[PDB]
Every structure is written in C-alpha cells, then in structure tokens.
Coordinates of C-alpha atoms and ligand atoms in Angstrom, one line a residue:
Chain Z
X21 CA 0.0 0.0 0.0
X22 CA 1.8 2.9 -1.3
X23 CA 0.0 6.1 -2.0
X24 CA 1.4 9.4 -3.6
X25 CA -1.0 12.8 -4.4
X26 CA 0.0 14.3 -7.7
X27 CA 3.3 13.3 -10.0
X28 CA 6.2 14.1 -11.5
X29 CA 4.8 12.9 -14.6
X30 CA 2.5 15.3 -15.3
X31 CA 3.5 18.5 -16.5
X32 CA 2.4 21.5 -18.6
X33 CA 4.5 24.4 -20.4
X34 CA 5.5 27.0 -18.2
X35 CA 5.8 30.6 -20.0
X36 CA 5.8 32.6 -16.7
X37 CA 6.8 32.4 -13.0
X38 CA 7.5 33.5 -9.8
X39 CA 11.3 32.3 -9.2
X40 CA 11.5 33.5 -5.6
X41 CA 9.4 35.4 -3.0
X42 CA 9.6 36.1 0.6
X43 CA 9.2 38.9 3.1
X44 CA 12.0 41.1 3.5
X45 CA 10.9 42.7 6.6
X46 CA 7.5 42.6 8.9
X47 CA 5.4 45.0 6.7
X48 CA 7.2 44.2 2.6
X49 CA 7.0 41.5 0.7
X50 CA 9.5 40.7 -2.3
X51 CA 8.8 38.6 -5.3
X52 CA 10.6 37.6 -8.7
X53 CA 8.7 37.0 -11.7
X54 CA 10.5 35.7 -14.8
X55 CA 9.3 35.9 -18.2
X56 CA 10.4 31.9 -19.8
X57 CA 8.5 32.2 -22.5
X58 CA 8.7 33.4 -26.0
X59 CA 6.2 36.3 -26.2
X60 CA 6.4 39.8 -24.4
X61 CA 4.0 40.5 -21.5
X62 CA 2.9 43.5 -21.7
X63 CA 1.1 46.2 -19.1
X64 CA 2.2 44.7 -16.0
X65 CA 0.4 47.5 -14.2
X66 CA -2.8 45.8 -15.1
X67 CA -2.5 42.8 -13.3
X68 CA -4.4 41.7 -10.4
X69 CA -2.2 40.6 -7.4
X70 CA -3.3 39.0 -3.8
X71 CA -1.8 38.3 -0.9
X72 CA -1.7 37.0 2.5
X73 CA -1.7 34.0 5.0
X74 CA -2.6 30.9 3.1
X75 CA -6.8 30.7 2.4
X76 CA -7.1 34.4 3.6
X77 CA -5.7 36.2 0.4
X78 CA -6.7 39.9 -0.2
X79 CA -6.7 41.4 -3.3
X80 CA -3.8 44.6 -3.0
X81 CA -4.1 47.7 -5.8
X82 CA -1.3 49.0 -7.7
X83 CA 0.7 52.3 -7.1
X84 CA -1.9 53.5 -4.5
X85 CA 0.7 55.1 -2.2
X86 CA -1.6 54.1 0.7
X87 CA -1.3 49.9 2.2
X88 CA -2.2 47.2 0.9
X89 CA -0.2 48.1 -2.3
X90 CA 2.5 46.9 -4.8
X91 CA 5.2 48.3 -7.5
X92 CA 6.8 46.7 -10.1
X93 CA 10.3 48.1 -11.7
X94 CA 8.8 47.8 -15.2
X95 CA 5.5 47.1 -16.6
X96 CA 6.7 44.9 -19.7
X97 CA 8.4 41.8 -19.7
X98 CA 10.6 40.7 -22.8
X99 CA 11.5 36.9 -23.0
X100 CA 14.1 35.6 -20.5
X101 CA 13.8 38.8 -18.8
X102 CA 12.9 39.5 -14.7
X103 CA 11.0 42.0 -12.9
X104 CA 10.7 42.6 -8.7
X105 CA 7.0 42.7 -7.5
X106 CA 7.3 44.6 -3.8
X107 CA 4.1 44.8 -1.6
X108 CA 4.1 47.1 0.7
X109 CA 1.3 46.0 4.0
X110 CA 0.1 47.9 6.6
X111 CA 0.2 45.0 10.0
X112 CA 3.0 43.1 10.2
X113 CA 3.3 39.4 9.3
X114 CA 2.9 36.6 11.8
X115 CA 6.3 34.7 12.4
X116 CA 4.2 31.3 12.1
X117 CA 2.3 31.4 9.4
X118 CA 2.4 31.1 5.6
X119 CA 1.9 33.0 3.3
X120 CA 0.9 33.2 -0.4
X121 CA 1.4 35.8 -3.3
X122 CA -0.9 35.6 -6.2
X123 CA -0.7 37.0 -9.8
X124 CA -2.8 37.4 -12.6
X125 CA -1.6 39.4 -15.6
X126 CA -4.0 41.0 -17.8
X127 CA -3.7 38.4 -20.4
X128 CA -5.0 35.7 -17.7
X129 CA -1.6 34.1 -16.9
X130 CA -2.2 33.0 -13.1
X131 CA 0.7 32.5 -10.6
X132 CA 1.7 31.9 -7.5
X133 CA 4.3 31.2 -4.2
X134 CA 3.9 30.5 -1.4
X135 CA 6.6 30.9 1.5
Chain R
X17 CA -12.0 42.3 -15.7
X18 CA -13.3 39.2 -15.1
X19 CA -10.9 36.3 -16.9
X20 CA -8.4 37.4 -14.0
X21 CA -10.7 37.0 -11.7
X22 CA -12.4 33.1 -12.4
X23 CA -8.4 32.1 -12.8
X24 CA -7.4 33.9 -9.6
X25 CA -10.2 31.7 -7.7
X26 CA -9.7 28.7 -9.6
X27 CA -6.1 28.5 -9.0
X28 CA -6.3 29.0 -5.2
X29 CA -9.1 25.9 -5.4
X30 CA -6.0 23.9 -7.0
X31 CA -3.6 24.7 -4.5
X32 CA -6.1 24.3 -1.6
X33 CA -7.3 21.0 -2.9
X34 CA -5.1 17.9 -1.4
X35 CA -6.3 14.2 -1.4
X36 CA -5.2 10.9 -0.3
X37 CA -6.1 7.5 0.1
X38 CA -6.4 5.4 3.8
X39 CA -7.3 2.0 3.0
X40 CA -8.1 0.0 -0.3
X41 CA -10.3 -3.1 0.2
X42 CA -11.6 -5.4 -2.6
X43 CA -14.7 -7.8 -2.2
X44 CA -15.3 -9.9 -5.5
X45 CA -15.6 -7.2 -8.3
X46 CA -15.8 -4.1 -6.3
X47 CA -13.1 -2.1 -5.0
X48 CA -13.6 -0.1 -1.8
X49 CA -11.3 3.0 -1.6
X50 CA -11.3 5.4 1.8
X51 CA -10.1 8.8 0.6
X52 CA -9.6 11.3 2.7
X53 CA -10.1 15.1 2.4
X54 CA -6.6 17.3 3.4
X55 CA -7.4 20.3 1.8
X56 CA -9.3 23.0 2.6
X57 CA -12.0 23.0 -0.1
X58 CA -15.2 20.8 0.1
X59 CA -15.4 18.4 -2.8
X60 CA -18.5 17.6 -4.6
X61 CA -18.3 18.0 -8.5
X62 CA -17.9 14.1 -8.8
X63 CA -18.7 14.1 -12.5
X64 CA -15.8 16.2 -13.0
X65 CA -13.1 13.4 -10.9
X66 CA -11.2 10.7 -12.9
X67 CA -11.1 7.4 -11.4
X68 CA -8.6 5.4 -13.4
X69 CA -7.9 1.6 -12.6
X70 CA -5.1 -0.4 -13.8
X71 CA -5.1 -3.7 -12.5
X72 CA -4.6 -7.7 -13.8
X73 CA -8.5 -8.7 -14.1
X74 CA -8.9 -13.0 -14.1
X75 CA -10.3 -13.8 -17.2
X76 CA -11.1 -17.8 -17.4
X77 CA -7.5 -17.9 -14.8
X78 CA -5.7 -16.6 -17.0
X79 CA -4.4 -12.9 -15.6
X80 CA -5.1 -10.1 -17.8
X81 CA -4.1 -6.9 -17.8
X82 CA -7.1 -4.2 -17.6
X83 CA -6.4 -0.4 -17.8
X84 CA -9.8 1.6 -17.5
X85 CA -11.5 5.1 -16.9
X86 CA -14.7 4.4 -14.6
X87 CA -17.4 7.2 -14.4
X88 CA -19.3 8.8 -11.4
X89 CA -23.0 7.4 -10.6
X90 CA -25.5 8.6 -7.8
X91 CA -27.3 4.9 -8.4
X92 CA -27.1 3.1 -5.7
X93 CA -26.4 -0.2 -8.0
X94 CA -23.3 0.6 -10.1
X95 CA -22.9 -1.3 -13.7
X96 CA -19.2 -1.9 -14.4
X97 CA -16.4 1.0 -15.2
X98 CA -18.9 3.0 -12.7
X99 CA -18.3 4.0 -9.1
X100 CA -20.2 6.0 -6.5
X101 CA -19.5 7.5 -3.2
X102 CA -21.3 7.2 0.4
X103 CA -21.3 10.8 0.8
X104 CA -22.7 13.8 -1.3
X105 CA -20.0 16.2 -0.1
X106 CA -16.7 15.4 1.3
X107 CA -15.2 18.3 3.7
X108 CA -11.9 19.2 5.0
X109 CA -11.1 16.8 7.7
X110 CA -13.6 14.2 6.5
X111 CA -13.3 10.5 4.5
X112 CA -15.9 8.5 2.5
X113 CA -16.0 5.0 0.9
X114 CA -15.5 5.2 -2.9
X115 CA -17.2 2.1 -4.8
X116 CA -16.0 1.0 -7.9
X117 CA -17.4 -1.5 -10.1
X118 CA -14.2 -3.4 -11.5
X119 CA -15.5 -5.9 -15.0
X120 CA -14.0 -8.6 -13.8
X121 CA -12.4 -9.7 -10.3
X122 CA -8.7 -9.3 -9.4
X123 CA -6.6 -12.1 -10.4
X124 CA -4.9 -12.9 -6.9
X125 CA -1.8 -11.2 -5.5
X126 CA -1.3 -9.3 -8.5
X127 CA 0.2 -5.4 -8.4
X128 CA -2.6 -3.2 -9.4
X129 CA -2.6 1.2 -9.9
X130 CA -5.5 3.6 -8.7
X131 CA -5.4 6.8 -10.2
X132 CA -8.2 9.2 -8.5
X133 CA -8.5 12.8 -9.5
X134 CA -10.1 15.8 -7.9
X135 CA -12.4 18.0 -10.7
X136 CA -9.9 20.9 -10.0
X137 CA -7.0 18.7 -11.2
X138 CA -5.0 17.5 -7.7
X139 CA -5.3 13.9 -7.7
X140 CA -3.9 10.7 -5.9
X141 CA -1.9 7.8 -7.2
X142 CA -2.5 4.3 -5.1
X143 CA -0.2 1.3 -6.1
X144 CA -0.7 -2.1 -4.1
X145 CA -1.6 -5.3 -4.4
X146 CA -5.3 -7.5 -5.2
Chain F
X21 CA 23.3 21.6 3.8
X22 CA 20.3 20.8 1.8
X23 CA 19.4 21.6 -2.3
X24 CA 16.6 20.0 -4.1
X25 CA 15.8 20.5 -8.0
X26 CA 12.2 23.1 -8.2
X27 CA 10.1 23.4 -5.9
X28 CA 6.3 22.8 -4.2
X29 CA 6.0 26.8 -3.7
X30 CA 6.1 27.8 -7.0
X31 CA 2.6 26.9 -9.2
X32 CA 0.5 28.1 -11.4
X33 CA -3.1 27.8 -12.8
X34 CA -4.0 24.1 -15.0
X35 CA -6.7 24.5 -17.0
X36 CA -5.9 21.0 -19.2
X37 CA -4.0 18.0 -17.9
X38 CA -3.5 14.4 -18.6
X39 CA -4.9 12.5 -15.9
X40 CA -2.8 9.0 -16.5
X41 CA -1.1 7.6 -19.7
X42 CA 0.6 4.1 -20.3
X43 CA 1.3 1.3 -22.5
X44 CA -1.9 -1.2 -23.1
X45 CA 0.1 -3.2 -25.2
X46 CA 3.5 -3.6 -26.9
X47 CA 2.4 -1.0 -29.7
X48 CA -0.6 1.1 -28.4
X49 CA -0.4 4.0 -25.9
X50 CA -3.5 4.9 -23.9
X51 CA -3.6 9.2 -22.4
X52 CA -7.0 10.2 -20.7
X53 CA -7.2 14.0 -21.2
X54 CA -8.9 15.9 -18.3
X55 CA -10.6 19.6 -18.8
X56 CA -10.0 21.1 -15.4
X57 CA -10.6 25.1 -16.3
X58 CA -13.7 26.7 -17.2
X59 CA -14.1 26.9 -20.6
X60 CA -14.9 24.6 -23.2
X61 CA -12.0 23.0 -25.5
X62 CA -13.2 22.0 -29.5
X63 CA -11.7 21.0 -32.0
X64 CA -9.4 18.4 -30.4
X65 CA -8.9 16.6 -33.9
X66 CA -6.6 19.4 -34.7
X67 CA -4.6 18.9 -32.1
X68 CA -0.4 18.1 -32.3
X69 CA 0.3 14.8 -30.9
X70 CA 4.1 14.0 -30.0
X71 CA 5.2 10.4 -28.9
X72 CA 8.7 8.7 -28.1
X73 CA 11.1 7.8 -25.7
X74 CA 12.4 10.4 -23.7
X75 CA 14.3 12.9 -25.9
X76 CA 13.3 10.9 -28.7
X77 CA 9.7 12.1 -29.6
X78 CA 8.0 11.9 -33.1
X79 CA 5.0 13.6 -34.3
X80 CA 1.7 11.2 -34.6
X81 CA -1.0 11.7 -37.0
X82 CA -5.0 11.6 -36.4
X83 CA -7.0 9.2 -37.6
X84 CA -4.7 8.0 -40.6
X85 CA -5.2 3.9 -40.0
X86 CA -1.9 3.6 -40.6
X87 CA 0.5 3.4 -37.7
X88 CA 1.9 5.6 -35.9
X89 CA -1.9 7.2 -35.7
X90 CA -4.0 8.5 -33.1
X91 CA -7.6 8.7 -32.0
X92 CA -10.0 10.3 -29.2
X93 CA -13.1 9.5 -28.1
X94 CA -14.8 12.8 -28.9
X95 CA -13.5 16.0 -30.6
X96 CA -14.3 18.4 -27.9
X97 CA -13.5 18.8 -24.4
X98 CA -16.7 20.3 -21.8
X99 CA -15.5 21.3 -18.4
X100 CA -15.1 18.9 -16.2
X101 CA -15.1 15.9 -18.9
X102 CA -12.6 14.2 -19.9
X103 CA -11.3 12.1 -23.4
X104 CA -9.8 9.1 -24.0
X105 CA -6.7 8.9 -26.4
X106 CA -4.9 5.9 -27.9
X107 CA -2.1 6.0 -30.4
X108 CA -0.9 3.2 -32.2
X109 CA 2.1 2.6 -33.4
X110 CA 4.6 0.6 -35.8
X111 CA 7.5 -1.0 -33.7
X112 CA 7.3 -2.2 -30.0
X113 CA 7.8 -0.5 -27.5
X114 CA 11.8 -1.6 -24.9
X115 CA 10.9 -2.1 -21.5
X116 CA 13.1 -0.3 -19.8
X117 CA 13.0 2.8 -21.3
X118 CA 10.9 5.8 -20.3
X119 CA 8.3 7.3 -22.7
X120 CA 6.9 10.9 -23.4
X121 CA 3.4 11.4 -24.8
X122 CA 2.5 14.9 -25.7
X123 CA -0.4 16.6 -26.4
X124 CA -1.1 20.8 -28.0
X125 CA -4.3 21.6 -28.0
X126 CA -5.2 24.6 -31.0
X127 CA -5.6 26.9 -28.9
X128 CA -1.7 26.2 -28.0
X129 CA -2.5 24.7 -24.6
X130 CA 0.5 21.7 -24.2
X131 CA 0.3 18.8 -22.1
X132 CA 2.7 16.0 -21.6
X133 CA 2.7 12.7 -19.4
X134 CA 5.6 10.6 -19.1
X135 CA 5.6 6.2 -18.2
Chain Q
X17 CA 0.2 26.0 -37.3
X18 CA 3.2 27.2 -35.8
X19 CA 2.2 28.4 -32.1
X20 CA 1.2 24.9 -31.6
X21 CA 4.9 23.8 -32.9
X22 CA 6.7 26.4 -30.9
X23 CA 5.1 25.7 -27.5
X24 CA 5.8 21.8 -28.6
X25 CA 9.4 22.7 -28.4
X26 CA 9.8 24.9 -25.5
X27 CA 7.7 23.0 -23.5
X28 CA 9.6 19.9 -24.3
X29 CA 13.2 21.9 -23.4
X30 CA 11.2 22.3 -20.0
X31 CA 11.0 18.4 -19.8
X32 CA 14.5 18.1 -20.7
X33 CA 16.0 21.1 -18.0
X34 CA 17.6 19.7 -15.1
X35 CA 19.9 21.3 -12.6
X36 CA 21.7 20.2 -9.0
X37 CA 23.8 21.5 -6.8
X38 CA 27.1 19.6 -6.2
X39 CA 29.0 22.0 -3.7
X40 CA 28.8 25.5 -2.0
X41 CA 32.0 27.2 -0.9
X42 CA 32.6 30.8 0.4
X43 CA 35.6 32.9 0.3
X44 CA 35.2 36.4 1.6
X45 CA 32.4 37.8 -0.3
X46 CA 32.5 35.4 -3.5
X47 CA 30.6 32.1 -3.2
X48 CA 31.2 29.7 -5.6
X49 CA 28.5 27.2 -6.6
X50 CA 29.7 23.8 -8.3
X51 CA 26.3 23.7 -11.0
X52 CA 25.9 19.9 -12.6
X53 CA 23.5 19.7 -15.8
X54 CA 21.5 16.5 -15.0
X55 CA 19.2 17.1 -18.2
X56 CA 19.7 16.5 -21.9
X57 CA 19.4 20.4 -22.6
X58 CA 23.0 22.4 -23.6
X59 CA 22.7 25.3 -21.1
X60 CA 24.3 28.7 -21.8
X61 CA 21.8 31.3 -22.0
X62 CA 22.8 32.9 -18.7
X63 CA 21.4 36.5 -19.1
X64 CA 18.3 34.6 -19.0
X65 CA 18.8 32.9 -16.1
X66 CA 17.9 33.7 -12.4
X67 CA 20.3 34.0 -9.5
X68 CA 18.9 35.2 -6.2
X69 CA 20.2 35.3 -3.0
X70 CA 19.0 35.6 0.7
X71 CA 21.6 35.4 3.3
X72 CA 22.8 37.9 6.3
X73 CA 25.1 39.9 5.3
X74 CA 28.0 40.9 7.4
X75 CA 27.6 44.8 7.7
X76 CA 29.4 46.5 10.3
X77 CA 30.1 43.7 12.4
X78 CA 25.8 43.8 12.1
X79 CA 24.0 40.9 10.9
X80 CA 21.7 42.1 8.1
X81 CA 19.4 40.6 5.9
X82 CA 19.9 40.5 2.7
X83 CA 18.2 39.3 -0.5
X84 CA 18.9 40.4 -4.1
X85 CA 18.8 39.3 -7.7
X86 CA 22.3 39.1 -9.3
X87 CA 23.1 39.8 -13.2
X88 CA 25.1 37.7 -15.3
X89 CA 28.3 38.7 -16.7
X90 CA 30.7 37.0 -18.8
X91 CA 33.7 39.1 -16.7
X92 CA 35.9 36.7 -14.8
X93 CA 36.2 39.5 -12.1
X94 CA 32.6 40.2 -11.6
X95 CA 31.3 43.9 -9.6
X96 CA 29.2 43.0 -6.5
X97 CA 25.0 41.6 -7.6
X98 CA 26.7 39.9 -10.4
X99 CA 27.9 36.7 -11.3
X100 CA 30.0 34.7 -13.5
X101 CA 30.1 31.1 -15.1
X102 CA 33.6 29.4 -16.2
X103 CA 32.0 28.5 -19.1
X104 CA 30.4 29.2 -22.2
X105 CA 27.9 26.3 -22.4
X106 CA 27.6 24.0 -20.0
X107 CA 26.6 20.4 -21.9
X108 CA 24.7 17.6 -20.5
X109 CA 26.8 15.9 -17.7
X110 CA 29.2 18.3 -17.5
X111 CA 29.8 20.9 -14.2
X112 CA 30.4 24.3 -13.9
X113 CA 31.5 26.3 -11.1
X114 CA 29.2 29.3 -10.5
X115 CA 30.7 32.4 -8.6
X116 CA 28.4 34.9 -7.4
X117 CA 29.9 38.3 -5.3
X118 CA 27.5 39.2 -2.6
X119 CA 28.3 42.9 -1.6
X120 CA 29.4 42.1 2.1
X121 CA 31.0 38.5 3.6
X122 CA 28.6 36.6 5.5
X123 CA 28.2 36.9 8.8
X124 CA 29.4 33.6 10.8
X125 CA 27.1 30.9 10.6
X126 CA 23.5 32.2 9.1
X127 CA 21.7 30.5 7.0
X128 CA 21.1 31.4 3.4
X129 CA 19.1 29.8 0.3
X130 CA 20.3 30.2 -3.1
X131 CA 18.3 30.3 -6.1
X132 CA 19.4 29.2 -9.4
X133 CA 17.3 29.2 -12.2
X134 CA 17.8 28.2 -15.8
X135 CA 16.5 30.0 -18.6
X136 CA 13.7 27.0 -19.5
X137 CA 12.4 27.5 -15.9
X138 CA 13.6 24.5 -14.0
X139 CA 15.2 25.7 -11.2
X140 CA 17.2 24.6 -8.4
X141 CA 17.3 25.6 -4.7
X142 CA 20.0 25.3 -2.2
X143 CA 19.9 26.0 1.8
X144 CA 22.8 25.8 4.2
X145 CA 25.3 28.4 6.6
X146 CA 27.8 30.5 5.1
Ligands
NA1 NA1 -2.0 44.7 5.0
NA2 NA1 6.1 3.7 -34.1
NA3 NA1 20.1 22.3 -26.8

C-alpha cells in the first residue's frame, strides 16, 4: 500500500513564473517574476495581485501610495527577462504562518508562491 | 475584468485541494477505496473526478491486464467501469468509501494502480496489491 | 546543507491535464485528457500529438489507419469531462525505457505525461 | 500552425532542464556554486537565467538581511550583484562552477538559500550556513 498525491509525470509548459518570493521585513513583501517564454508580457500594471496567509488572500491595488499596495520596476516583460514585484502591508506578518502571493496578468496568466 | 478573476479563484481551489487515500479493500468485483479530504475546499463536482484503474482482471484464470476510466453514478447499484461515493459532499477533515465497479475480479496477489483525480485537477496515485 | 531541484511553492493555474497515460500493449499507448478550467476546449482533432522515448519524440498523426496514428473518443473537451486517447504505433515499444506522450491543444495549450 | 509547434518545443526543453547543486563554498564575499546539468538540454543562456540570493550579510560587524537578484556577466572579475560562469555552455553531464559576489562577507554561521534558475524555468534551490 503505497499512495502518492499528484506526479512528476504530469506536467504542462510554463511561460511565466515567480522564481523566488519572501518577506523582506514585517510590513514588505518581495517577489521575482520571470518571463520563460517566448512572447512579451505587456502592461504589468494591469494585473491583479493577492496576498496574504494561506486561504485568507486579499486582493492589493497597484501604485496607490496608501497599504495594501504593490510596485513593479517595469510594466513589460521581454523573453528571458525578470522584474521585482514589492508589496508594501500595513500590520506586520505573523512569524508562524504562511503565506501566499498571487498573480494574474491581464492576459489571464495565473501564478503563484507561497513561502 | 473578469478572466483574472475566475483564474485567480480557480487557482487558489487547486492549491487548496489535497487528497489521499487510507485504505483499499476489494470484495469480488468491487473495489472499496477510503479517501480522505486534506485540503481545505469541500469536494462535490464528482462528475468532474477521474477514477482510473489499472489492474490484472482473471479472465477464465488466465491474468489479464485491464487499464480503465470508470465514471461517477448517484445509483445506488453501479454497472461496471462506474463508481459511487457514500457521501454527497466530502469536507476538510472528512473521508468517504469510494465504490468501484471493476468488469472482472482481481486475479490474486497481483500489483494493481488507482489513479483518483479531484475535478480541480490535484489527484492521488495508489499502487498495491489484489 | 540541503538543495533540491524546483520546488512545491512555485505553481501556477491548469486548466488542461492528462490525468494518466501508459502502454496497453506492446504497440498502443493509452492518455485520458482531463478539462480542469472553465471553458470549453473543440476542435481536439486538430490537435499536435508527439510520442517517443524520452528525448526521442516523433509527431503522430489523427486518424490516418496507418501506424503511428491516433484517436480520441470525442472531438471536444466540456468542463469537467474528460477524453480518451490511444495511439498506435509501428515498432514495440523496450521495456526499460521511459516514454513521453504529448499533447497541444489549438488553442496552444500543451500537455505532456511521461511512463 | 506554428504556435502549436513552438510551445511543442519549449515545452519539451522544459521536460529536458535539469539542474543540481554539487558543492557550495565561500571565500570572503564570493561564493562559488559547483552547478551539474542533469538534463539533456545544452545550457548557456545565462542572461536569461535567475540567481537570487537571501543570506545575512555581514555589515558593520551587524548581521543584516539581505536578499537580491544578481546579473550575469561573462567578466571573470565580476562587480558585486553579479555573477560569472567558467563556461560558455555548460553540456549535459558536465559541471560548472558558478561564482556569485554578494556585496558584504557573511556573517558567521547564518543560514542562506540560493536560487538558481535556468533559462527553460527549471530551477534549483539550495539551503545551508555561510
Ligand atoms: Na496589509
Ligand atoms: Na512507431
Ligand atoms: Na540544446
């Protein structure tokens, strides 16, 4: 009786992703996302992005000035290029708890991390 | 706009979604799987799962191998390549009795592979012996 | 000290998947192809269908009766449903070798599942 | 049609992507990552990699956290948030020997991850003390 949920057989072509996030202090959040596929993504400032502890994700609103909200140090995204997504909160984070960041580009290209 | 928004909630269902199996049973042609719920959403959509069996069915004894997909039924007397479940809604936290009609019985102590898959697309892979 | 290849963190959004694929016989492959988004999939005879041994994959063509071909079970793809696939093909397959079968939808979705 | 053929390719250079790290080594601010290719996939566009750091950096005698995204260069004598391969291509079965300059020498015994991440996605992830 051996029992295993999902595989590593079963996979499907990746053309975006977040390579690495995590909090960089109690109130900012750090993310990477990485372009790896072959067609520029374009008006980053568009997308919709969520965050928080894991089931309890809020959506957060670009450029507001005002917490929840995030930045992005470009809004398009060539091939084999990177950008850093930083949300900015306004209570700190719980040291044990995780969390989970959450984008969706206006094109509908959904992803996520969780740390 | 509202494509980001059904793929934002649909991709928090998949990674909320978790499944796994306790205890396989067989009893002549019907195979009785306990799957347990370890996620956080409630799962219901049974039409929308993939039960998959591959197993070595005894056909006149000679052992044969058998590689199906069996659908979902709410009749309480399953034809076979069907199964049901004793449950209309399995929570977080709780575990139900899968039924699955097999077309033939098990040929004995041979390796079989049960393949059961969530509508949102997590799944489970149980590989044993009937 | 402790490094493992990817990781369970980083996902994104399936909307197509195959559930299960493997060898019925010495030259026939069977692939059940699972609709897990939200929108209907058509057209599925126009799909690109790949098969081979790892690093070794050849295109398959539909319907042709003459191997290596391939079939499905119906030509579109409702949420929720799912389609049965079976290619057939012209020299056995080694048994210990690992396989590829992949699948690209029109629409450009692509799929794979490796035995 | 021919975005059906491209996403055939890339997403089979995806399959094929493979990455694992042999050995980590520090001397004063440079770490040096020993990078094997366990896939069938030549590797050598390293602009379109990813290398990212988190570790706690020495700074003043202060131990500070630090996380960045580092550049590739193809300068043996790389400027800190850069990093350098020594080699052009790094074939299947072969290893390379990453060195990446932080800005300031790790502080004594923290922990730090390391984030490598080929062009084609697959990644690889390494924890330990510096
Ligand atoms: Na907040
Ligand atoms: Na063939
Ligand atoms: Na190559």
């Amino acid at each position: 009786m051996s029992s295993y949920s999902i595989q590593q057989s079963q996979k499907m072509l990746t053309q975006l992703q977040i390579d690495y996030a995590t909090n960089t202090s109690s109130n900012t959040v750090v993310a990477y996302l990485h372009n790896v596929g072959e067609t520029t993504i374009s008006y980053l400032q568009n997308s919709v992005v969520y965050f928080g502890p894991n089931g309890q994700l809020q959506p957060v609103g670009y450029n507001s000035g005002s917490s929840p909200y995030w930045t992005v140090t470009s809004n398009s995204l060539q091939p084999g290029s990177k950008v850093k997504i930083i949300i900015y909160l306004s209570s700190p984070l719980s040291s044990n708890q995780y969390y989970t960041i959450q984008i969706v580009t206006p094109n509908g290209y959904t992803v996520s991390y969780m740390f | 706009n509202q494509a980001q928004e059904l793929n934002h909630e649909l991709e928090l269902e998949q990674l909320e979604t978790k499944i796994t199996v306790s205890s396989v049973s067989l009893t002549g042609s019907t195979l009785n799987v306990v799957l347990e719920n370890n996620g956080s959403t409630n799962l219901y959509d049974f039409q929308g799962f993939s039960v998959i069996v591959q197993y070595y069915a005894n056909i006149s004894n000679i052992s044969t191998f058998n590689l199906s997909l069996y659908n979902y039924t709410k009749n309480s007397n399953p034809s076979p390549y069907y199964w049901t479940i004793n449950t209309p809604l399995l929570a977080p936290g709780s575990q139900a009795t899968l039924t699955i009609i097999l077309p033939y019985p098990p040929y004995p102590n041979t390796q079989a592979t049960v393949v059961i898959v969530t509508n949102y697309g997590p799944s489970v892979i149980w590989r044993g012996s009937l």
